[PDB]
Write an enzyme that holds these catalytic residues in place. Structure first.
Site, PDB file in Angstrom:
ATOM      1  N   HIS A  64       0.842  -1.200   0.000  1.00 50.78           N
ATOM      2  CA  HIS A  64       0.000   0.000   0.000  1.00 50.78           C
ATOM      3  C   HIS A  64       0.861   1.227   0.000  1.00 50.78           C
ATOM      4  O   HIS A  64       1.749   1.376   0.858  1.00 50.78           O
ATOM      5  CB  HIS A  64      -0.914  -0.049   1.224  1.00 50.78           C
ATOM      6  CG  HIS A  64      -2.014  -1.077   1.097  1.00 50.78           C
ATOM      7  ND1 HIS A  64      -2.445  -1.844   2.136  1.00 50.78           N
ATOM      8  CD2 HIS A  64      -2.757  -1.461  -0.011  1.00 50.78           C
ATOM      9  CE1 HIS A  64      -3.423  -2.660   1.702  1.00 50.78           C
ATOM     10  NE2 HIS A  64      -3.607  -2.432   0.388  1.00 50.78           N
ATOM     11  N   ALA A  65       0.638   2.104  -0.981  1.00 53.04           N
ATOM     12  CA  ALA A  65       1.595   3.147  -1.312  1.00 53.04           C
ATOM     13  C   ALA A  65       1.890   4.093  -0.150  1.00 53.04           C
ATOM     14  O   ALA A  65       3.051   4.456   0.063  1.00 53.04           O
ATOM     15  CB  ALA A  65       1.103   3.918  -2.520  1.00 53.04           C
ATOM     16  N   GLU A  67       1.761   3.618   3.062  1.00 53.01           N
ATOM     17  CA  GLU A  67       2.243   3.016   4.313  1.00 53.01           C
ATOM     18  C   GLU A  67       3.772   3.034   4.369  1.00 53.01           C
ATOM     19  O   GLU A  67       4.422   1.998   4.393  1.00 53.01           O
ATOM     20  CB  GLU A  67       1.649   1.608   4.480  1.00 53.01           C
ATOM     21  CG  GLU A  67       0.143   1.680   4.755  1.00 53.01           C
ATOM     22  CD  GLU A  67      -0.626   0.415   4.422  1.00 53.01           C
ATOM     23  OE1 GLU A  67      -1.829   0.510   4.072  1.00 53.01           O
ATOM     24  OE2 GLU A  67      -0.065  -0.716   4.519  1.00 53.01           O
ATOM     25  N   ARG A 122      -3.222   4.801  -2.072  1.00 52.74           N
ATOM     26  CA  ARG A 122      -3.169   3.427  -1.532  1.00 52.74           C
ATOM     27  C   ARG A 122      -2.896   2.363  -2.620  1.00 52.74           C
ATOM     28  O   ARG A 122      -2.030   1.479  -2.453  1.00 52.74           O
ATOM     29  CB  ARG A 122      -4.510   3.107  -0.869  1.00 52.74           C
ATOM     30  CG  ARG A 122      -4.689   1.661  -0.416  1.00 52.74           C
ATOM     31  CD  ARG A 122      -6.096   1.473   0.130  1.00 52.74           C
ATOM     32  NE  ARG A 122      -6.463   0.088   0.460  1.00 52.74           N
ATOM     33  CZ  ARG A 122      -6.138  -0.523   1.600  1.00 52.74           C
ATOM     34  NH1 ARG A 122      -5.365   0.086   2.507  1.00 52.74           N
ATOM     35  NH2 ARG A 122      -6.579  -1.750   1.835  1.00 52.74           N
ATOM     36  N   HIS A 192       2.571  -4.065   6.626  1.00 48.37           N
ATOM     37  CA  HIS A 192       1.599  -2.996   6.404  1.00 48.37           C
ATOM     38  C   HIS A 192       1.659  -2.013   7.567  1.00 48.37           C
ATOM     39  O   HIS A 192       2.367  -2.232   8.565  1.00 48.37           O
ATOM     40  CB  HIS A 192       0.186  -3.597   6.321  1.00 48.37           C
ATOM     41  CG  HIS A 192      -0.100  -4.312   5.031  1.00 48.37           C
ATOM     42  ND1 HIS A 192      -0.828  -3.747   4.042  1.00 48.37           N
ATOM     43  CD2 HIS A 192       0.264  -5.573   4.581  1.00 48.37           C
ATOM     44  CE1 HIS A 192      -0.926  -4.616   3.012  1.00 48.37           C
ATOM     45  NE2 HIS A 192      -0.237  -5.719   3.325  1.00 48.37           N
ATOM     46  N   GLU A 266       0.830  -5.089  11.052  1.00 49.59           N
ATOM     47  CA  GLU A 266       0.442  -3.679  11.005  1.00 49.59           C
ATOM     48  C   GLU A 266       1.347  -2.952  11.972  1.00 49.59           C
ATOM     49  O   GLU A 266       1.268  -3.176  13.179  1.00 49.59           O
ATOM     50  CB  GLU A 266      -1.009  -3.461  11.434  1.00 49.59           C
ATOM     51  CG  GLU A 266      -2.059  -4.193  10.625  1.00 49.59           C
ATOM     52  CD  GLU A 266      -2.411  -3.552   9.314  1.00 49.59           C
ATOM     53  OE1 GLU A 266      -1.765  -2.582   8.836  1.00 49.59           O
ATOM     54  OE2 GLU A 266      -3.410  -4.042   8.736  1.00 49.59           O
TER      55      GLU A 266
HETATM   56  N1  LIG Z   1      -7.148  -8.836   4.735  1.00 49.72           N
HETATM   57  C1  LIG Z   1      -6.120  -9.685   4.824  1.00 49.72           C
HETATM   58  N2  LIG Z   1      -6.072 -10.733   4.002  1.00 49.72           N
HETATM   59  N3  LIG Z   1      -5.136  -9.500   5.711  1.00 49.72           N
HETATM   60  C2  LIG Z   1      -5.051  -8.316   6.573  1.00 49.72           C
HETATM   61  C3  LIG Z   1      -4.643  -7.088   5.738  1.00 49.72           C
HETATM   62  C4  LIG Z   1      -4.882  -5.795   6.504  1.00 49.72           C
HETATM   63  C5  LIG Z   1      -4.624  -4.560   5.639  1.00 49.72           C
HETATM   64  N4  LIG Z   1      -4.777  -3.341   6.432  1.00 49.72           N
HETATM   65  S1  LIG Z   1      -4.365  -1.909   5.778  1.00 49.72           S
HETATM   66  N5  LIG Z   1      -2.777  -1.865   5.749  1.00 49.72           N
HETATM   67  O1  LIG Z   1      -4.937  -0.903   6.639  1.00 49.72           O
HETATM   68  O2  LIG Z   1      -4.861  -1.869   4.420  1.00 49.72           O
HETATM   69  C6  LIG Z   1      -5.560  -4.582   4.462  1.00 49.72           C
HETATM   70  O3  LIG Z   1      -6.753  -4.249   4.618  1.00 49.72           O
HETATM   71  O4  LIG Z   1      -5.167  -4.932   3.321  1.00 49.72           O
HETATM   72 ZN   LIG Z   2      -1.727  -1.867   4.077  1.00 55.96          ZN
END
Ligand SMILES: N=C(N)NCCC[C@H](NS(N)(=O)=O)C(=O)O
Ligand SMILES: [Zn+2]
Ligand SMILES: [Zn+2]
Length: 304
Positions: A64-65, A67, A122, A192, A266
């Site tokens: 994600h860009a 982050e 993102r 992330h 995270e």
């Molecule tokens: N959703 C999966 N498969 N894993 C957890 C990913 C969490 C991740 N959080 S973020 N960095 O806020 O975008 C996501 O939503 O892709």
């Molecule tokens: Zn992310």
């Protein structure tokens, strides 16, 4: 100029991948696993001392860009490998016995865009049919309950799942690499931010992996280890109940390929700065995260 304590633009990270490889030929090799929508090389570092039939751990950053702390962390991990190899017992054992594949930035096109145009981007930067809205959420683009819960069918939305699983050049490239190296890759780690969590499958449905107890205990222990340094508090558990249900993520996909240790991290913080975590927190964030990553690595090595 590259610095591990600042956020570095893509040109700088790219040059760093070349330089860190050239400076450490006995520990690092570099390949490109594919190209992005815009034609940028997706670089992968293989970190480890050569040896026979080595198992591997795969880690990516920069899905994600916005982050930026994620990208910084992959660089820090390599920093730590090169600095402490030979001096520190655990890191030395890790690199002698395992290879680490470190993909420092997956979504290169989006990352460049956060530097040049929009800090809060993102998604990827690919086009979509029938609209001028740009990009697919790469962590909704994997073949894992694809485009069901927690993923949007609208190309103008931040969790757009794409036109099809692996529609994006970047996610196809990653999935291809992992499929081609499945017999050696024992763990998959995807970095992330934010919210301070260690997540494991599943997110795409409310269901549990067969080794749920093992993953739960490992995440719990890694969280405790992380907290030892600065007291930073992480939560942990299966993605669907720990953060939210969300389909098409790479962690779930990798697990369903047979990779038994699959975690989404995270990193900091819990929302004060969110994605715009200040550079002054890079060191502390990366150092505490190293403890969790090394804990997981040591577990994998010890339970082959
Ligand atoms: N959703 C999966 N498969 N894993 C957890 C990913 C969490 C991740 N959080 S973020 N960095 O806020 O975008 C996501 O939503 O892709
Ligand atoms: Zn992310
Ligand atoms: Zn350190």
């Amino acid at each position: 100029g590259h610095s591990y304590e600042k956020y570095n633009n893509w040109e700088t990270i790219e040059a760093w991948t070349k330089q860190v490889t050239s400076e450490n030929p006995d520990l690092i090799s570099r390949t490109a696993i594919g190209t992005t929508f815009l034609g940028n090389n997706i670089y992968l570092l293989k970190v480890g001392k050569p040896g026979p039939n080595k198992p591997a751990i795969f880690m990516d950053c920069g899905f994600h860009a916005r982050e930026w702390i994620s990208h910084a962390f992959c660089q820090w991990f390599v920093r730590e490998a090169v600095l402490t190899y030979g001096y520190e017992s655990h890191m030395t054992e890790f690199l002698n016995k395992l290879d680490f594949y470190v993909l420092p930035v997956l979504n290169i096109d989006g990352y460049i865009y956060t530097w040049t145009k929009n800090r809060m981007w993102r998604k990827t930067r690919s086009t979509n049919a029938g609209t001028t809205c740009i990009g697919t959420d790469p962590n909704r683009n994997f073949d894992a309950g694809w485009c069901t819960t927690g993923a949007s069918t609208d190309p103008c939305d931040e969790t757009y799942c794409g036109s099809a699983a692996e529609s994006e050049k970047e996610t196809k490239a990653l999935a291809d690499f992992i499929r081609n190296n499945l017999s050696s890759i024992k763990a998959y780690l995807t970095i992330h931010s934010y919210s301070q969590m260690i997540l494991y499958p599943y997110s795409y449905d409310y269901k549990l992996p067969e080794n749920n107890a093992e993953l739960n205990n490992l995440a719990k222990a890694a969280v405790k280890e992380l907290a030892t340094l600065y007291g930073t508090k992480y939560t942990y558990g299966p993605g669907a109940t720990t953060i939210y249900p969300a389909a098409g993520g790479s962690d779930d996909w990798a697990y369903d390929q047979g990779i038994k240790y699959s975690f989404t991290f995270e990193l900091r913080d819990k929302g004060r700065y969110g994605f715009i975590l200040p550079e002054s927190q890079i060191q502390a964030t990366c150092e505490e995260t190293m403890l969790a990553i090394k804990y997981v690595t040591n577990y994998v090595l010890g339970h082959l």
